Each structure stands twice: as C-alpha cells, then as structure tokens.
Ligand binder design. Structure first.
Ligand code: 8JR
Length: 136
C-alpha cells in the first residue's frame, strides 16, 4: 500500500503547551482530583497507520491509553479521565475530527498539522482548549 495524506500525523509527539485545559475539563465534568493530576501531565502521543487502521497511543504519568480505529466507524473508548464513550473519528479537509458521546453529552477533539506541530483543539459547548505537540 502507498502513502496516505494521514501519514502527516504519524510519529512520536510531546506536549509543549496547553491553554484553558482546566476549564475544558470542568465543562466535560471531570472531578477535582482528576483535573489536578491530569493537568500536570506532559504526555507523549504516538500515532501510527497500518492499512485502514489508525492507532493513537498516549503515555504519561497520569494514564497510558491506546485507541485503534477506522475512519468513520464508531468504536468504544474509555478515556483517560475514565468516561466510557462512543467515539467516531473522521477526516475533514486534513483535520482529524474526533467526537465523543456519553450520557447525552458530546465533545469534539480536532487534531491538525500546523508547521512542524500537531495542534489539538478540544471543544465542550462554548469552552475550547488548545494543546500543542512537537516531534519527540
Ligand atoms: C491528560 O488528560 C486527558 C487526556 C486525554 C483526554 S481525552 O481522551 O478524552 N481527549 C483529549 C482531551 C484533551 C487533550 C487531548 C490531547 O490529545 O492532548 C485529548 F486526547 C482527557 C479528557 C478529559 C480530561 C483529561 C484528559
């Protein structure tokens, strides 16, 4: 199989900046202690593609997580803050768009390549957080 546009996300990434993440987590409903510990973490994100399957791993002192998925196909996800959600991830004009649904709520996580960075924009209702990753 040949190259895919989504190969631009493949690699090992490290968190270098975070804005408004505590307020985003508050809007999602994350409790005090999890917010405090999760907000300290500086995760590494490892993204790989094998055929139609994309795998995103996150390693940190807070939690280690791994999801594998096919674009447009819903899957079960237990998030780092221990929500059990239904997730669907699609590609929209170069942007990975990840929607998590649970308990009648939903949040959208967008991942995009910007210069040499991977920029993650998390939205819950009117509250947005921006997390920026660089190559490890
Ligand atoms: C480090 O603590 C966390 C990690 C991951 C998630 S998440 O799995 O639900 N989605 C998500 C949200 C924000 C940033 C990223 C990112 O990529 O940096 C992300 F993937 C969390 C959700 C709530 C509270 C803490 C979370």
């Amino acid at each position: 199989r040949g190259s895919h546009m989504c190969d631009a996300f493949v690699g090992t990434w490290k968190l270098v900046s975070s804005e408004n993440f505590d307020d985003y987590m508050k809007e999602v409903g994350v409790g005090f202690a999890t917010r405090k510990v999760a907000g300290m973490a500086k995760p590494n994100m490892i993204i790989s593609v094998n055929g139609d399957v994309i795998t995103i791993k996150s390693e940190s002192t807070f939690k280690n997580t791994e999801i594998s998925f096919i674009l447009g196909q819903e899957f079960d996800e237990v998030t780092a803050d221990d929500r059990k959600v239904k997730s669907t991830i699609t590609l929209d004009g170069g942007v990975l768009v990840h929607v998590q649904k649970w308990d009648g709520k939903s949040t959208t996580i967008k991942r995009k390549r910007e210069d040499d960075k991977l920029v993650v924009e998390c939205v819950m209702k009117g509250v947005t957080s921006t997390r920026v990753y660089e190559r490890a």
